[PDB]
Amino acid sequence: GVFNYETETTSVIPAARLFKAFILDGDNLFPKVAPQAISSVENISGNGGPGTIKKISFPEGLPFKYVKDRVDEVDHTNFKYNYSVIEGGPIGDTLEKISNEIKIVATPDGGSILKISNKYHTKGDHEVKAEQVKASKEMGETLLRAVESYLLAHSDAYN
């Protein structure tokens, strides 16, 4: 079957700046500002646009070793990002792929909110463990606050 779960996290960083660092330059910032979350980001197939495959490895702590991600869509103007987890991690047994959509909306105060969306593809009527979804919510949130600390520490960046 197909299950969809949503989330929304706030950030002080304006959408314009957050996009460049969190999305446009994630594969170069995450392993730097969040080592206990991302160990290394390897490129497999593609230059970096739609159809690209990046091998994201995790530290020697998490239960997962790596995860293959496929770049689907990257809207630089509408601050939208779409990637799919095709291999590694939870993928297997009953789970096939994971369609993810990230959108950075600006707020009236000058901040921004992340409208993340997870769409899992299970086997027949098989469902997904709550902890699985709970993990991504923490995965992205930790990275978020990981990028905020840096941006606020280095104002002369991504601008």
CA distance 135 to 66: 14
In angstroms, what CA-CA distances link 69 with 25, 62, 77, 81, 113? 15, 18, 22, 12, 23
Angle subtended at Cα 70 by Cα 68 and Cα 73, rounded to the nearest 5 degrees: 155
Q: Is 83 annotated as a binding residue?
A: yes
Q: Is 54 annotated as a binding residue?
A: yes
Cα Rg, the chain, nearest whole Å: 15
Q: Is 100 annotated as a binding residue?
A: yes
Tokens representing 55? 């091998």
In angstroms, what CA-CA distances link 112 with 11, 14, 20, 115, 125? 5, 6, 13, 10, 36
Q: Is 97 annotated as a binding residue?
A: no
Binding-site positions read 54, 81, 83, 100
Pick out the residues of the known binding site for brassinolide: 54, 81, 83, 100
